[PDB]
């Protein structure tokens, strides 16, 4: 079994470890710290027996909607990074991390939409998001450093 709670400064070391092991976008320590201090209410970790096994790091924005056809200014929640240690996958951790972050984006930060970028090859992640009713709304060409395309996936809150 796992539990969720908001991330704390003392979680950052384990979060970075997870990020280093599971993702190619290896942000520096100060990046994690600033997102925790600025958007901490929507920054969650998953815990198994006192260890962090997953996390979701958000960014809160104000700007043009990426869902609406017309230029329209909205509050947006942006998933910067989400990862779960391999041993603890297929347990619903990412699903519950996203739900918790979404609820805070909506209630704490008045977000009207949530969105993220995902590698077009990232089959597990895409399945996750489509199950949570994210839609592929844009294709960011050459979004990743190696040139790989991203789907911009989004949904209203
Ligand atoms: C994507 C990731 C975060 C999902 O974590 P997770 O805790 O295993 O996800 P969940 O258990 O909540 O998944 C829920 C649903 O998503 C889908 N899904 C998740 N992983 C899948 C896979 N490998 N293949 C097919 N569907 C998958 C399934 O529908 C799953 O439902 P189910 O378990 O009942 O079959 C995880 O695989 C991961 O950390 N990958 C490496 C880092 C990464 O790519 N992060 C996302 C970048 S945008």
Numbering used by the authors: 11 to 167
What does the published report state?
Nα-acetyltransferase (Nat) performs this modification and transfers an acetyl group from acetyl-coenzyme A (acetyl-CoA) to an α-amino group from the first residue of the protein substrate. A BLAST search identified Ard1 from Crenarchaeal Sulfolobus solfataricus (SsArd1) as a homolog of the Ard1 subunit of yeast NatA and Naa10p subunit of human NatA. However, no Sulfolobus homolog of the auxiliary subunit of NatA was found, so SsArd1 alone may be responsible for the protein acetylation. SsArd1 has a mixed α/β-fold with 7 β-sheet surrounded by 4 α-helices and contains 4 conserved motifs, a feature unique to the GCN5-related N-acetyltransferase (GNAT) family.
The crystal structure of the SsArd1-CoA binary complex was determined at 2.13 Å resolution and the SsArd1–CoA/peptide ternary complex at 1.84 Å. CoA-bound and CoA/peptide-bound SsArd1 structures were almost identical and could be superimposed, with root mean square deviation (RMSD) 0.12 Å for all Cα atoms. In the crystal structure of the SsArd1–CoA/peptide complex, we identified a clear electron-dense Fo–Fc map corresponding to the first 2 residues of the 6-mer Alba peptide. The Alba peptide fragment is located in the pocket formed between the α1-α2 loop, β6-β7 loop, and β4 and β5. The first 2 residues of Alba bound to SsArd1 via a number of van der Waals interactions and hydrogen bonds. The main-chain of Glu127 and side-chain of Tyr154 interacted with the main-chain of the first residue Ser by a hydrogen bond. In addition, the main-chain carbonyl of the second Ser formed a hydrogen bond to the side-chain of Tyr37. Structural alignment of ternary complexes of SsArd1 and hNaa50p revealed that residues of substrate binding for hNaa50p, Val29, His112, Tyr138 and Tyr139 were located in almost the same orientation and overlapped with the residues Glu35, Glu127, Tyr153 and Tyr154 for SsArd1. A comparison of Val29 of hNaa50p and Glu35 of SsArd1 in these ternary complexes showed that the side-chain of Glu35 from SsArd1 is too close and features steric clashes against the side-chain of the first Met residue of the substrate for hNaa50p. Residue Glu35 of SsArd1 may play a critical role for substrate specificity in Nα-acetylation.
